[PDB]
Design a protein around this ligand. Structure first.
Ligand SMILES: [Cl-]
Ligand SMILES: [Cl-]
Lengths: 332, 160
């Protein structure tokens, strides 16, 4: 019979068994089947992965929408996800009518799917732009579809980095600490623009692990507090300038904390004969948590504090407010 | 007979002649043929370019490995080189079992081939990352495969 050879032809096209193809009809049991055939339109669609047991067919629309016992599925949309397309023998120039989401219309050797309302009439002498424009809710280029979107959304990792979505153990949210996973992974990690993850970095962790333009949420290891790490600024610079901030703070009268990381000379030796270093732990690191201020202690007469003196004497010409203060983290 | 119409269906799928398709069986002469059909799995594979003269078939594995008179060839691997894929009607979410290198499993509209050990079990509610990770020896994105590798290895020439 012609049914068997057709099921046979369909089965080879989709790469399934002959027994896994079924003709649509009313009451047709759908369980176990992988491809359904609409004999009226002579179009075949692969079926959703887990149709329930004892599920029967009710109706199949011209757009490929299937109604059955346990619900409804758009087979045209499902075919798009599987890149199972029918390439119409027309162009935008010749005109055509689009009935399903998995039909492709050609313009200068390029195939477009339609993501808007159905059916889609395309008159003679048209263009993807002239007949509804090119957009996610309109005409979509089917050729190279994913790699195009990644390029148009800057989702392609720099050479030598891995996309954060492909790295083992990472959870992309703001609550999960991705630190252990990120540094167990031996290579660099790409986080795209607009994407934030929580990565509670430890002070020894090389922040050059991360590339791209995303952000990290970093927990303060000593206070109930979070800090934002901007990877884009880390990768490209933030274009900020010491003089810019200092002059801006003078103009805006905003606070300007100036931190210094240094050695013995900046620690404060020998700015006063009773100079002493900031407190350090048994490991040799700065004590934390802390309420220590070096400028009010052993580093009261370091060059940093004389620098502050000049700033504050310049500030005094506008206000009595103390907008310039140091954070001298320098140890001999 | 159903054999002829199947060979016919296969021949049009691969774009060869009906006479250039052959069913696998023991002792089946392979010379001259371009496509072989596994009737048990109902999967077809295009054959290596120059199978020797008078070469006969011994065995064909579930992964698509063909053993014959003059040696052995992985037809699944050969299909990958020719981008001849079967797109399974499953997702990583629904779960599946992978048997060959030329089977494709979908995750959010993207197709992955498996480059590791076979068969590959993929449980319910999985992810390419959760089920073996994405790497040259694991899950590989089949869509745009070459242009992706060129981009990820800086192999694209500057304009001009
Ligand atoms: Cl730079
Ligand atoms: Cl201590």
């Amino acid at each position: 019979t012609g049914i068997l050879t057709n099921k046979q032809a369909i089965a080879r096209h989709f790469g399934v068994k002959q027994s896994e193809v079924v003709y649509f009809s009313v009451g047709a049991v759908l369980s176990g089947y992988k491809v359904i055939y609409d004999k009226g339109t002579q179009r075949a669609y692969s079926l959703p992965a887990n149709i329930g047991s004892g599920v029967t067919a009710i109706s199949l629309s011209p757009a490929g929408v299937l109604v059955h016992s346990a619900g409804s599925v758009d087979l045209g949309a499902l075919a798009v996800t599987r890149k199972e397309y029918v390439t119409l023998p027309d162009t935008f120039t010749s005109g055509s009518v689009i009935q399903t989401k998995n039909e492709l219309l050609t313009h200068n050797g390029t195939q477009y799917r339609w993501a808007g309302g159905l059916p889609k009439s395309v008159p003679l002498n048209s263009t993807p732009v002239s007949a509804g424009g090119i957009s996610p809710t309109a005409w979509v280029i089917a050729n190279d579809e994913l790699i195009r979107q990644e390029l148009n959304n800057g989702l392609i990792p720099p050479v030598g980095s891995t996309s954060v979505y492909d790295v083992p153990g990472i959870v992309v949210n703001t609550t999960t600490d991705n630190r252990a996973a990120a540094y167990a992974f031996p290579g660099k990690i790409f986080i795209p623009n607009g994407v934030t993850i929580r990565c509670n970095l430890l002070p020894d962790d090389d922040v050059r692990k991360f590339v791209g333009e995303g952000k990290l949420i970093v927990k303060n290891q000593w206070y109930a507090k979070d800090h934002t790490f901007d990877i884009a600024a880390s990768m490209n610079g933030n274009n900020k300038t010491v003089n810019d901030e200092i002059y801006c703070a003078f103009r805006d009268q905003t606070f300007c904390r100036i931190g210094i990381i240094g050695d013995s000379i900046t620690d404060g030796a020998w700015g006063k004969q009773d100079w002493s270093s900031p407190p350090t732990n048994s490991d040799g690191d700065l004590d934390a948590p802390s309420t220590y201020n070096h400028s009010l202690s052993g580093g009261s007469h370091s060059w940093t504090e004389h620098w502050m003196n000049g700033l504050l004497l310049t500030q005094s010409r506008r206000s009595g407010e103390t907008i310039y203060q140091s954070a001298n983290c320098s140890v001999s």
